[PDB]
């Protein structure tokens, strides 16, 4: 079963060493984990004031995708109206992957900003809706699967090369980037021999996962364009999620 | 997308 080219190999590098540059708190995240308190957020009878704190806790997490993206050579060779497009579409979906990967099964609880503990209640009912439950029980069954730094990686750059999103002016350009990382992905994986059988089917299925979560935020916006203004968000939050 | 411009520069 085939591993990893030399050509695959330098991708794999420059790839990992984007996402260990830009994960929030690298790797002394673990003990930086301060829980929000069980104040904010829990049943109804949603609060305006957790909604506008989670707003405030998102945009630094927004700034580590871009700065992700940004050290790719192969994201930095679109035009910018690509990268724009690019960045929209895959925001969410890599900072969904990246709380997941931080799930405590004991507290049962994400880490957000390699810092913040919270609870399926709290981002339920802080604002993410249905969406919260499944970014925790994609947190729950990716604990099986043991992904390390580069397959987060290249799970994120998968996401972002996804040629598939309206406006994109060099689709095809797009579309053999993400294919060089698809099969340096394949590659990898089989030689890490993971136990899980299939484990390539099955990771298929959870970049599938993270595209539905992405693309519930159509909904979960004008979720709350309803009550407020829009001045009460910051920039960087409105043209993400617009 | 103003301030996403500019990020990406
Ligand atoms: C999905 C995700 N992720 C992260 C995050 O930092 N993940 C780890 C990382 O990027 O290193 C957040 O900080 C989030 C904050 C809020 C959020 O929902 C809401 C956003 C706005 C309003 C209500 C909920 C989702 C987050």
């Known amino acids: ?242 | 997308n103003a301030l996403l411009r500019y990020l990406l520069d």
């Not at chain 1, 984990?33 to 998102?58: C, M, N, V, W, Y």
């Not at chain 1, 099964?105 to 981002?123: D, F, H, I, K, Y």
């Not at chain 1, 809706?129 to 990686?153: K, P, Q, R, Y």
């Open chain 1, 1 to 242: 079963k085939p591993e990893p080219t030399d050509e695959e190999w330098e991708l794999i590098k420059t790839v990992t060493e984007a996402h260990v540059a830009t994960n929030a708190q690298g790797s002394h995240w673990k003990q930086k984990r301060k829980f929000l308190p069980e104040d904010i957020g829990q049943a109804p009878i949603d609060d305006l004031e957790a909604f506008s704190h989670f707003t405030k806790i998102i945009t630094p997490a927004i700034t580590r995708v871009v700065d992700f993206a940004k050290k790719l050579p192969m994201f930095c060779e679109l035009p910018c109206e690509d990268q724009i497009i690019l960045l929209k579409g895959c925001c969410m979906e890599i900072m969904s992957l990246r709380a997941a990967v931080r799930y405590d099964p004991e507290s049962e609880t994400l880490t957000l900003n390699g810092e913040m503990a919270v609870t399926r209640g709290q981002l339920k009912n802080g604002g993410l809706g249905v969406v919260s439950d499944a970014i925790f029980d994609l947190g729950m069954s990716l604990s099986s699967f043991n992904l390390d730094d580069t397959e987060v990686a290249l799970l994120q750059a998968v996401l972002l090369m996804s040629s598939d999103r309206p406006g994109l002016a060099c689709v095809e350009r797009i579309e053999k980037y993400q294919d060089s990382f698809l099969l340096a992905f394949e590659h990898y994986i089989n030689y890490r021999k993971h136990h899980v059988t299939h484990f390539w089917p099955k990771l298929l299925m959870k970049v599938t996962d993270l595209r539905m979560i992405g693309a519930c935020h159509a909904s979960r916006f004008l979720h709350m364009k309803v009550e407020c203004p829009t001045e009460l968000f910051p920039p960087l939050f409105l043209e993400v999620f617009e």
